[PDB]
Each structure stands twice: as C-alpha cells, then as structure tokens.
C-alpha cells in the first residue's frame, strides 16, 4: 500500500506526461495528414480530374486519420486498462495478456 499510496500521484503525473506525449504524436499525425490533405487539395482541385476523383484522395486522407486516431485511441485505452489494473492490483488475481 504505502509506496503505491504516495507514488500513485507521482505515477499518475507520469501517466499524464506519457499521454501528453501520446497526444503530441497524435496531433503530429493530425498536422502531417492535414498537410497531406492540403496536398490532395493542391494536386486535385488544380487539374481537370474528375470532381470525385479529386476528392478520392481527400477521402483517403480522412480515412487515414480515422484509422490513425483509432490506433491512438486503442493504445490509450490499453494504457487506461493497465492503469486501472495497477490501481486494482490485489493478491489472488489472475493477470493474463503477458
């Protein structure tokens, strides 16, 4: 208990720092594919290409964002799960997922 009791605040601060770094990676993804989506704009609405084929790259970029934020949300949920497990760690408990 005691070391968990006082380092819960410290380790939750470390968790906040880690999730802030995760969100730094996440808005790095946001900015990178926002730039690539405006590149889709510039290589799409600047030619005589099909009015949908010019937005096919737009949809591809936005779908890349949906799946990328899915990745980020899933690993953040994994971290939330491990934190909840660490708080609720008790003797005679079965940890699986090595």
- Kindly report the backbone phi and psi dihedral angles of residue 66, in degrees, each rounded to the nearest multiple of 5, phi listed first: -65, -45
State how far the Cα of 31 lies from the Cα of 65, in Å rounded to an integer: 10
Tokens of 79: 């971290």
Cα dihedral 81→86→89→94 (10° resolution): 50
Tokens of 84: 């909840």
Tally of CB atoms within 10 A around 75: 13
Burial class (CB in 10 A: 0-12, 13-18, 19+), 64: middle
State whether the Cα torsion 84-85-89-90 is positive or negative: positive
DSSP for 63-79, please give it. HHHHHHHHHHHHHHHHH
Resolution in A: 3.4
Whether 32 contacts 92, CB under 8 Å: no
Tally of CB atoms within 10 A around 4: 11
Identify the experimental approach.
cryo-EM
């Amino acid at each position: 208990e005691e070391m968990r009791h006082n380092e819960l605040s410290t380790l939750e601060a470390e968790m906040a720092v880690e999730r802030k770094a995760v969100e730094d990676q996440r808005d790095g993804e946001l900015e990178a594919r926002a730039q690539k989506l405006e590149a889709d704009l510039a290589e799409l609405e600047a030619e005589g290409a099909k009015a949908d084929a010019r937005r096919k790259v737009r949809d591809g970029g936005e779908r890349e964002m949906r799946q990328i934020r899915d990745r980020a949300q899933r690993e953040l949920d994994r971290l939330e799960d491990i934190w909840s497990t660490f708080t609720k760690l008790a003797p005679k408990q079965l940890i699986v997922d090595e």
